[PDB]
From a paper:
We also obtained a co-crystal structure of tolcapone and V122I-TTR at 1.9 Å resolution. This is of particular relevance as the V122I mutation impacts directly the weaker dimer–dimer interface, resulting in an increased rate of tetramer dissociation. As for the WT-TTR co-crystal, the twofold symmetry axis along the hormone-binding pocket creates two binding modes of tolcapone related by a 180° rotation. The conformation of tolcapone in the T4-binding site and the contacts it establishes with the mutant V122I protein are virtually identical to those found when it is bound to WT-TTR, explaining why tolcapone is also a high-affinity binder and a more effective aggregation inhibitor of the kinetically unstable, FAC-associated, V122I-TTR than tafamidis. According to model 1, tolcapone shows identical binding affinity for both V122I-TTR T4-binding sites, with a Kd=56 nM. The binding of tolcapone to V122I-TTR is entirely enthalpically driven with Δh=−11.5 kcal mol−1 for each independent binding site and an unfavourable binding entropy TΔs=1.6 kcal mol−1. Indeed, V122 is located on the periphery of the H β-strand, which forms an antiparallel β-sheet with another monomer, stabilizing the AC/BD dimer interface. The V122I mutation impacts directly on the stability of this interface and tolcapone compensates this destabilizing effect by bridging the H β-strands of adjacent monomers through specific hydrogen bonds and ionic interactions.
Author numbering:
A (entry chain A), B (entry chain A), C (entry chain A), D (entry chain A): 10 to 123
Write the structure that this text describes.
């Protein structure tokens, strides 16, 4: 599995379960094409987004829809979502984990690449 | 000054000087309109982005063009940029500082609201 | 002012006001000597910790007592405090801002050096 | 496995492999007793630190010796180490993952509790 997303909740100290994640790929157009999407599991992880055949060199944007999540825990947040834009597979295919740590007024994101 | 952006470099432990910052506002269209832009100063700060007259309730996206910055320090980074999407002035006008801490494979962003 | 500490609250999106901060310096003993302390102001900042005469090369530990702060906002946190250990003035005297961003189950710390 | 530590490198976008981790527990003395220690594996993870029998309610400090790690990648860092102090098992036994994301001038730490 070449691209996985993991999301953590800094407020409850737990995985963020059932969070919506959308992945876009920048086309030759200079437009964002919808690439893949899904919701995180009980472990805060989302696997099965894509296959190594489909996941080519390019510029990707990962959007994590965090505002719904925060409402659903009784919280009126501030961000519309968390977004991460990165270039992928530039050096040949890699395994990428894009991880996000969420708080109402802040977030951190990191890529772990193997 | 109702909206200011501050950018820090986690690699050199210093302000990120002369970084490009673009602000967009979501229009009734559901399109991003260009709202304001500029480059950070020697202190890593960008003031004068807007006036309190122009800075109304709405959804804003702040894009920090970090890839140029990292190249200019001799570094091939991973993100195309850092992006922060948030709703503003929902509760009446506030002063917003959107701060970003940059590393090649990671970033953190926070809003400080007064 | 050669050493300043700034503390932000990721939960309320605001400065952390009236937070206790203790600074220790490692002695020849290999013991921590109490070096300086104080509480953050309404801006989340603590200035006047030391003078450039007193702030010599050495290993320092900055401890931010965050648990009291979180209780005082109605919150039972997880960390006893945030701690940052660093070597100072190794390359000649600098101005150091040690900044901390707090959440109940997480924190980030950075040094900005001039 | 009730306590595990994971360490990530924000500079290389990878796990931090073979990093030293020491765990201390605050005794009735108000002294830190050495509780457990080990080095992270190729995945940046350290398991087998303790057993659920030994891991009781108390105040723990996790110290990650990051300075050696940064030297070993050709880097003169700033922190002596990363330290996390927290209260454990206060509400009955939990599984705790203490995760740390490292950069030369910054770090973030979070607890994920199950
Ligand atoms: C995500 C993040 C975390 C920490 C910092 C940060 O270190 C910082 C430092 C400052 O001197 C300062 O004035 C502010 N601010 O006003 O927000 C932030 C900046 C961004
Ligand atoms: C402070 C911080 C922020 C983000 C990460 C982080 O990126 C991360 C990545 C993982 O694959 C993973 O399994 C976990 N975890 O279990 O906690 C954390 C780690 C630490």
């Amino acid at each position: 599995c070449p691209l996985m997303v993991k999301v953590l909740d800094a407020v409850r100290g737990s995985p963020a379960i059932n969070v919506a994640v959308h992945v876009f790929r920048k086309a030759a157009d200079d437009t964002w094409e919808p690439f893949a999407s899904g919701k995180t599991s009980e472990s805060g992880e989302l696997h099965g987004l894509t296959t190594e055949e489909e996941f080519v060199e390019g510029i990707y944007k990962v959007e994590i829809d965090t505002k719904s999540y925060w409402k659903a825990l009784g919280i009126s947040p501030f961000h519309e979502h968390a977004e991460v834009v990165f270039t992928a597979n530039d050096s040949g295919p890699r395994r990428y984990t894009i991880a996000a740590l969420l708080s109402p007024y802040s977030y951190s994101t990191t890529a772990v690449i193997t």
